[PDB]
Design an enzyme around this catalytic site. Structure first.
Site: not given
Ligand SMILES: Cc1cccnc1N
Ligand SMILES: Cc1cccnc1N
Length: 165
Positions: A55, A60, A63, A102, A113, A122, A126
């Site tokens: 992504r 931005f 990721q 997350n 990211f 964020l 995060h």
């Molecule tokens: C399982 C998961 C999905 C999205 C971001 N972090 C993660 N650990």
């Protein structure tokens, strides 16, 4: 004592692009830094090598780190599937910031990211744990293969990774 440095050698549809290095803020977020460091060396038997940036949204972030599902739904830490939010000392101050993706409080795994803009909304949500040291030009090159919805126009992979010094 000195914060560790890791590298990612990036490829675009299998063609070498260049290297991005990161400083990891082990001094401020040791647990979170150590996870990324170890996933970058592959020393636990799994990690980032051969994974993709699934992504990418210009203006931005880029990721990645989903080495089990390859799409943003997977990944795992060196500690178990998930681990806690370590702290929120560091903030999303600008391009180059390295932060944990997350899915809720205390759900860090392996996904991360790289910011390509200030993402202050964020902060406190995060865990920021590093920054691009060299190769922000490579990150900007990567960013060009993204799109508004994040789907990449070419496959952006970590062809190799590891620890420098
Ligand atoms: C399982 C998961 C999905 C999205 C971001 N972090 C993660 N650990
Ligand atoms: C966040 C976390 C840490 C350790 C065990 N389970 C969890 N969900």
């Amino acid at each position: 004592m000195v914060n560790p440095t890791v590298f990612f050698d990036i490829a675009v549809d299998g063609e070498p692009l260049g290297r991005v290095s990161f400083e990891l803020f082990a001094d401020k977020v040791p647990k979170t830094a150590e996870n990324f460091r170890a996933l970058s060396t592959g020393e636990k038997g799994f990690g980032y090598k051969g994974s993709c940036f699934h992504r990418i949204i210009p203006g931005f972030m880029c990721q990645g780190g989903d080495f089990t599902r390859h799409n943003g739904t997977g990944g795992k830490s060196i500690y178990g599937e998930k681990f806690e939010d370590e702290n929120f000392i560091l903030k999303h101050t600008g391009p180059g910031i390295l932060s944990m993706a997350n899915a809720g409080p205390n759900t860090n795994g392996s996904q991360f990211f790289i910011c390509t803009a200030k993402t202050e909304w964020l902060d406190g949500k995060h865990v920021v744990f590093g920054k691009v040291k060299e190769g922000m030009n490579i990150v900007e090159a990567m960013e060009r293969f993204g799109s508004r919805n994040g789907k990449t126009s070419k496959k952006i992979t970590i062809a190799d990774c590891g620890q420098l010094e």
